[PDB]
């Protein structure tokens, strides 16, 4: 009795929806970041009694991250020089140094320079992963991506790199968050919080494994889609980093070619020829794979688990790919994953041979090509691997077979934004109460 309509504003209630997210980050360096002006500082509030649903496979911010990264790379490459005139027929025998089978470029070509009436027989070095033989006489060669796309040299000073980025919601939207220690990226979290901005997310580019990542709270977490037993990619998140080290011992000599633009070829290789390689702590890798197998055979309880190397595809998926400095690696991982398990600290080091190339097809798809300028001197690198991008083979009876994959770059960042979710605040609500309004 005597209950009347009343309305409230600023109510704590929300609904899920997709929206644009902000770009905010710390003070800009190098004159992955092109964003101005802001200085974020997040604060987290643990919400009592808040039970909320989550889903890593459906959240829109992964797609926004993907588009933002692609657009940022495009804007990075927008002012840089284009290597179109280099497409002319190369003449190549190239047996100068001790090892030419490794590189095989030592190639000459007629470039037009600075007058449009004079041509000069320059010559430079190239890895024959970047070079494809022309039909007929086997001494004629050509750049690999010229007949399919244009090639842009990366600007040497603009060194886009995994700089941390914070994604902030706009006013009227709140980024929810979950810190349940045993969350597989989907299902309800009864331990929820909110923040203005995400942590310093790094846009790392790698295949067969994701590095410089975060580490789980409990033991190793195995996140996967659960619509069907048939799955595209199974993400495994480590709780204990394993250190990977890599190096390129040779001393490379940069050279400039005038095609005020300039083209930065490899002038000469100094020092005796040694193929690039990387190191892994053998005992740590054994223990990590054993724990991964023990965790993984809970989902698949009555079958053996065997790890084997990938099959087919491009170099981006057949070998572990990544970047250190201004060079790109493609490291044979066959010796690592060749393991099997039954169904029932740094004493030794594994070494893996590895190859580098310059003409990088754009990682998502082919049609636009990047050319990496050579990094002079010798290179060393250290990084922390934190997760595995596995994918299983179906159609095999009484034996599972998980093998590395992950060519689709989106899985790298979907493995990180499982925490977050964006909701739209719905501040207005009604209720019954005692009332009067004088008339």
């Amino acid at each position, epitope marked *: 009795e005597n209950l009347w309509v009343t309305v409230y504003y600023g109510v704590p209630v929300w609904k899920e929806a997709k929206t644009t997210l902000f770009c905010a980050s710390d003070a800009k360096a190098y004159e992955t970041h092109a964003c101005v002006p802001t200085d974020p500082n997040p604060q987290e509030m643990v919400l009592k009694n808040v039970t909320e649903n989550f889903n890593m*496979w459906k959240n829109d911010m992964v797609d926004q991250m993907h588009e933002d990264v692609i657009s940022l790379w495009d804007q990075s490459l927008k002012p840089c020089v284009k290597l179109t005139p280099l497409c002319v027929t190369l003449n190549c025998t190239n047996a100068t140094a001790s090892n030419s089978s490794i590189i095989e470029g030592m190639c000459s070509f007629n470039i037009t320079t600075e007058l449009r009436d004079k041509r000069e027989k320059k010559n430079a070095l190239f890895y024959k992963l970047d070079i494809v033989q022309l039909d007929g006489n086997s001494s004629q060669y050509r750049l690999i991506n010229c007949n399919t796309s244009v090639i842009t040299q990366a600007c040497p000073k603009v060194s886009f790199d995994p700089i941390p980025i914070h994604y902030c919601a706009p006013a009227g939207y709140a980024i929810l968050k979950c810190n349940n220690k045993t969350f597989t990226g989907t299902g309800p979290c009864n331990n929820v919080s909110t923040v203005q901005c995400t942590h310093g997310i790094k846009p790392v580019v790698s295949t067969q494994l994701l590095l410089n990542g975060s580490l789980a709270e409990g033991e190793i977490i195995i996140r996967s*889609e659960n619509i*069907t*037993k048939n799955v*595209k990619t199974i993400i495994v998140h480590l709780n204990e980093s394993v250190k990977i080290e890599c190096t390129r011992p040779n001393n490379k000599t940069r050279t400039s070619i005038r095609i005020g633009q300039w083209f930065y070829a490899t002038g000469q290789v100094i020092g005796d020829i040694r193929e690039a390689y990387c190191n892994i702590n053998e005992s740590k890798w054994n223990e990590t794979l054993q724990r991964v197998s023990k965790k993984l055979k809970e989902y698949f309880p009555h079958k053996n688990i065997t790890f084997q190397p990938s099959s087919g*595809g*491009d170099l981006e998926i057949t070998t572990h790919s990544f970047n250190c400095g201004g060079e790109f690696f493609y490291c044979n991982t066959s010796s690592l994953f060749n393991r099997t398990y039954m169904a029932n600290n740094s004493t030794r080091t594994i070494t893996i041979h590895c190859r580098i190339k310059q003409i990088i097809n754009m990682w998502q*798809e082919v049609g636009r090509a990047m050319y990496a300028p050579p990094i002079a001197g010798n290179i060393t690198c250290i990084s922390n691997i934190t997760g595995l991008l596995l994918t299983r083979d179906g*159609g095999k009876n009484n034996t599972e077979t998980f093998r590395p994959g992950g060519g689709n770059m989106k899985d790298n960042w979907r493995s990180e934004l499982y925490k977050y979710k964006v909701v739209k605040i719905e501040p207005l609500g009604v209720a019954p109460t005692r009332c009067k309004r004088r008339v």
Partner: antibody
Amino acid sequence: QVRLAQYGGGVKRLGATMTLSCVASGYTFNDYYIHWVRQAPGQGFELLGYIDPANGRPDYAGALRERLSFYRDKSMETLYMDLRSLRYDDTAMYYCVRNVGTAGSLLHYDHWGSGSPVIVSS
Amino acid sequence: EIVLTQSPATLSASPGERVTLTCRASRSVRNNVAWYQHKGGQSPRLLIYDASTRAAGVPARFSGSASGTEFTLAISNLESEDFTVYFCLQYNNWWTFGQGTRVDIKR
């Protein structure tokens, strides 16, 4: 709109290698996996394997892992398959078929190709 | 593993009748099942891409329902064109097909 044309077929001699093909058309090439199914006469359909078009990752059936081999060509939007050492019971007509792949799982076929009959006999 | 034992081999129905088909899975396949219409050698067509959800462009007379491990496709107004071969599919595992059921003219 989408059409999956096929080429190759006819008679292939016993013990010889063969190479079918496919050509995508009215859709984004990278977004849909391609599968190769076959039907021997007097048998139900069965799957051989599937090839991701973007990164080229294949995956074959258990009984035919040695013989099969899948590869593509992104620029022409073309796919292939090679079945080495044809046996007599390879007499079958082979479809290429698309599937609707979600963000984290694969699902049913939607659009089937025109198919390529293959007769193994010398 | 999964053996979709589609049955019966041949269904007989007069034109205009209602008719039903069955696709017995050997074990659990969740809701991951689809049905197709085979033709005179031409490309098969998608009818239902779950146990019940009809596909785009399909005539409304085609309908399906789940029964756990057993699945069903039902045609309400059996026209002359529908007298053809239908096979069932499952995509919960490695992917298997049924033997195909023919729908012929009753007499």
